Amino acid sequence: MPMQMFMQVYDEIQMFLLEELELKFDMDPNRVRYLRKMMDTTCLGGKYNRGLTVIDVAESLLSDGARRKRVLHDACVCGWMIEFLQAHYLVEDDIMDNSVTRRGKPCWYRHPDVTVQCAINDGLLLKSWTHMMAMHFFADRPFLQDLLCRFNRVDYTTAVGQLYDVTSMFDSNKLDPDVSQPTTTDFAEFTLSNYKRIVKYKTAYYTYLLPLVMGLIVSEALPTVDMGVTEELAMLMGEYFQVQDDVMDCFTPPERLGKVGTDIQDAKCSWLAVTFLAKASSAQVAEFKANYGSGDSEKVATVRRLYEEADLQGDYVAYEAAVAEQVKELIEKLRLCSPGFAASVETLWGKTYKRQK
Amino acid sequence: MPMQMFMQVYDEIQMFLLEELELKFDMDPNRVRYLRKMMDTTCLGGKYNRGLTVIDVAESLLSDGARRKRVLHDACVCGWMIEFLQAHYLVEDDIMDNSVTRRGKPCWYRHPDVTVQCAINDGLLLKSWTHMMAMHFFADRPFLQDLLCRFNRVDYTTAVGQLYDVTSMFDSNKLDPDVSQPTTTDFAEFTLSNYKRIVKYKTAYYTYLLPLVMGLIVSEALPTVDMGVTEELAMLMGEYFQVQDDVMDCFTPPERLGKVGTDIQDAKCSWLAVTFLAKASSAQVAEFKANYGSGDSEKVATVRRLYEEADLQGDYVAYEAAVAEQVKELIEKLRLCSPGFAASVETLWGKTYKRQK
Ligand SMILES: CCCCCCCCCn1cc[n+](CC(O)(P(=O)(O)O)P(=O)(O)O)c1
Ligand SMILES: CCCCCCCCCn1cc[n+](CC(O)(P(=O)(O)O)P(=O)(O)O)c1
Ligand SMILES: [Mg+2]
Ligand SMILES: [Mg+2]
Ligand SMILES: [Mg+2]
Ligand SMILES: [Mg+2]
Ligand SMILES: [Mg+2]
Numbered sequence: 065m066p067m068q069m070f071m072q073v074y075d076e077i078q079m080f081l082l083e084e085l086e087l088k089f090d091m092d093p094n095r096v097r098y099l100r101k102m103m104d105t106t107c108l109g110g111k112y113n114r115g116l117t118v119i120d121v122a123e124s125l126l127s128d129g130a131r132r133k134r135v136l137h138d139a140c141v142c143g144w145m146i147e148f149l150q151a152h153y154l155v156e157d158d159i160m161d162n163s164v165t166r167r168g169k170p171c172w173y174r175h176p177d178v179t180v181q182c183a184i185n186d187g188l189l190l191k192s193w194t195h196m197m198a199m200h201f202f203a204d205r206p207f208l209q210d211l212l213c214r215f216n217r218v219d220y221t222t223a224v225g226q227l228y229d230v231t232s233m234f235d236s237n238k239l240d241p242d243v244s245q246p247t248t249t250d251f252a253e254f255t256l257s258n259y260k261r262i263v264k265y266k267t268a269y270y271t272y273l274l275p276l277v278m279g280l281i282v283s284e285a286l287p288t289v290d291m292g293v294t295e296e297l298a299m300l301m302g303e304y305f306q307v308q309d310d311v312m313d314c315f316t317p318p319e320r321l322g323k324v325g326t327d328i329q330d331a332k333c334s335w336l337a338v339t340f341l342a343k344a345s346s347a348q349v350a351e352f353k354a355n356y357g358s359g360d361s362e363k364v365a366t367v368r369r370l371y372e373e374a375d376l377q378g379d380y381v382a383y384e385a386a387v388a389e390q391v392k393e394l395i396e397k398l399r400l401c402s403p404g405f406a407a408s409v410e411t412l413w414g415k416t417y418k419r420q421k
Numbered sequence: 422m423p424m425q426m427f428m429q430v431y432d433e434i435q436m437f438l439l440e441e442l443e444l445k446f447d448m449d450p451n452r453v454r455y456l457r458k459m460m461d462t463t464c465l466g467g468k469y470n471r472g473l474t475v476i477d478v479a480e481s482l483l484s485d486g487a488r489r490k491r492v493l494h495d496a497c498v499c500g501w502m503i504e505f506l507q508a509h510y511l512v513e514d515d516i517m518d519n520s521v522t523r524r525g526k527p528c529w530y531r532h533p534d535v536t537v538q539c540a541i542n543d544g545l546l547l548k549s550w551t552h553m554m555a556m557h558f559f560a561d562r563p564f565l566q567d568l569l570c571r572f573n574r575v576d577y578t579t580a581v582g583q584l585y586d587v588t589s590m591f592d593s594n595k596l597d598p599d600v601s602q603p604t605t606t607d608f609a610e611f612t613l614s615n616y617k618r619i620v621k622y623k624t625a626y627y628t629y630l631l632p633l634v635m636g637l638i639v640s641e642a643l644p645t646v647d648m649g650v651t652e653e654l655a656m657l658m659g660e661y662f663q664v665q666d667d668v669m670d671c672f673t674p675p676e677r678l679g680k681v682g683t684d685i686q687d688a689k690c691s692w693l694a695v696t697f698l699a700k701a702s703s704a705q706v707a708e709f710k711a712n713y714g715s716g717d718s719e720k721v722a723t724v725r726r727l728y729e730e731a732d733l734q735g736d737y738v739a740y741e742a743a744v745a746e747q748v749k750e751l752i753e754k755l756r757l758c759s760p761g762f763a764a765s766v767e768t769l770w771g772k773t774y775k776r777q778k
């Protein structure tokens with residue numbers, strides 16, 4: 065059922081937005097139809113991990129079934145708010161990362177009828193919809209200001225995180241708008257510390273912390289949990305989710321992965337790249353340097369090979385276990401004063417640990 | 422004076438933002454310096470008409486010099502919020518219109534050390550800065566929810582406007598993501614009505630209504646003015662402003678304007694394009710259709726020529742006249758009940774009417 069009503073409120077939101085376009089922006093049915101397709105293709109098809117979480121927290125915490133209905137609905141709107149924020153990111157990320165496929169279909173900007181320019185602006189419309197939906201449905205909620213501050217910080221922090229990711233293959237000392245510069249040939253920026261920073265901000269926040277917080281907000285229970293504990297947790301699960309994407313991006317088939325991995329070509333600061341570079345010998349490192357950051361498929365075939373070659377899967381299992389115990393400890397601190405919350409945090413974790421997704 | 426204090430608070434905003442990056446986002450000095458360049462290069466160098474209006478309205482309406490200061494400072498923050506919104510729109514716009522030059526200098530995405538993928542994100546950071554500064558300075562302010570609502574509506578309206586603009590070369594009946602299509606060969610969509618709509622939503626709202634509103638809010642005088650009248654005035658002055666843009670985009674020399682015009686090449690729905698097509702003969706219309714929407718400079722020179730041929734500069738003057746007496750009428754209807762607002766509106770008009778920029 066959670067999914068049942070989630071989809072129902074999707075329909076609501078779609079109706080209100082599209083109809084509002086119709087009436088108040090002088091929109092013809094064609095463009096209106098365009099945007100319905102855009103919205104279904106970018107927003108739907110996922111597993112709604114972040115959205116559902118928000119409901120799940122709300123329902124755990126709500127502990128006159130009108131209050132039940134109000135929280136549940138709000139939670140669903142918040143859920144879609146996060147899902148549309150994510151859709152906005154992916155539309156724009158795929159463009160920035162020059163990706164081919166997402167979710168099993170082609171990236172939005174790679175549809176035959178969607179120009180790159182229009183995709184950038186469709187990206188922006190998606191972000192704007194989060195605000196429009198929030199303002200409509202929470203217009204007379206006491207928490208609306210706090211929700212919109214929080215949400216905007218996250219989205220800002222996500223963009224800062226993007227700045228890190230997108231500038232990780234340039235030696236940060238040569239960073240200047242006025243003077244051009246090429247892919248780093250010593251990679252001395254590739255470092256776990258740098259990697260951790262990029263992920264914290266580009267992923268952790270809008271993926272793990274924001275769904276938890278929104279669910280608490282609609283529940284009027286945010287002060288009841290230990291935030292410090294919650295923040296540590298979100299950061300941890302978030303980092304471990306990005307690393308999992310980094311490994312899959314190299315070693316899970318695009319068919320099961322519903323995308324094709326561009327980390328090796330984009331010369332990305334992926335987990336496999338940093339972990340290799342801190343453990344590998346000199347000949348391994350010199351091959352790598354000569355075989356990373358090039359679309360060539362013999363050179364791409366080399367790096368992938370070279371990872372397998374130096375036993376990264378092993379490092380990933382140790383990491384995973386290190387994380388998994390650290391999560392278990394933290395959740396138990398959290399159960400002490402907030403059992404209901406800790407339950408739904410566990411569930412979320414349960415959806416992440418050793419995902420094949 | 423207004424210009425001096427306006428520049429003071431910029432430095433205040435810049436400092437708080439860049440420092441917050443340093444402290445709360447773990448940001449190195451190189452990347453901090455980058456954002457300082459980007460922020461100066463995109464937010465500075467124009468005449469700050471949108472910004473300054475806010476201050477002007479605010480000063481006009483504030484009729485214990487602490488209150489004066491408070492209102493003046495907020496008016497400066499709001500102003501920079503709109504200016505930073507403008508900078509956002511222009512960085513993204515330039516990329517979407519594939520433009521060369523802006524404000525006498527190269528477009529942000531064209532700068533030698535700025536990648537297209539980085540520029541897209543720098544745009545987004547610009548937007549995020551509007552929220553951050555607002556939340557910092559208006560934290561404790563009663564009107565902060567209202568300001569952020571209104572602000573986001575306008576931002577959303579501006580993106581919808583751009584959806585119209587960007588898809589004005591595609592037969593709208595044939596608009597389908599899943600299916601490709603080329604530039605219209607009949608231009609049946611290039612109508613005044615369609616032009617009007619594009620302009621209304623893409624320019625009028627953030628350029629005229631928004632500064633007027635924000636100045637009102639920080640004065641705590643919004644309910645004092647006829648909003649219906651104010652809205653007419655803004656739409657009207659706004660439409661005109663764009664039409665003035667479209668005419669310079671083809672006749673004003675790039676060094677006078679500080680930007681090379683692309684409306685012809687991109688096959689845009691400009692005021693010249695829709696006016697011509699509604700008046701021109703059969704042969705005129707067919708040469709147009711054979712020479713519009715092409716980088717080729719002989720094809721471009723022909724269109725240009727053809728506009729002068731049809732004396733579009735006569736139609737413009739009549740338009741201008743009609744707008745100027747429509748504006749004069751509305752400003753008196755506003756002067757009746759709110760003579761302080763009316764004065765500041767007339768100053769704004771004063772800056773638009775027969776501008777050369
Ligand atoms: C508000 C910031 C605006 C700039 C662009 C949004 C940042 C997107 C951050 N992000 C997080 C996850 N992803 C997508 C990927 O995970 P994917 O596997 O989908 O390509 P990645 O490119 O790996 O970060 C993007
Ligand atoms: C909300 C994000 C959507 C993309 C960017 C916002 C739309 C920009 C609105 N706008 C208004 C005026 N301009 C720039 C021009 O006036 P210029 O001629 O200076 O490039 P134009 O592109 O003609 O509208 C952009
Ligand atoms: Mg990316
Ligand atoms: Mg990507
Ligand atoms: Mg990836
Ligand atoms: Mg444009
Ligand atoms: Mg442009």
Ligand SMILES: [Mg+2]
Nearest residue numbers: 666667670684
């Ligand atoms: Mg123009």
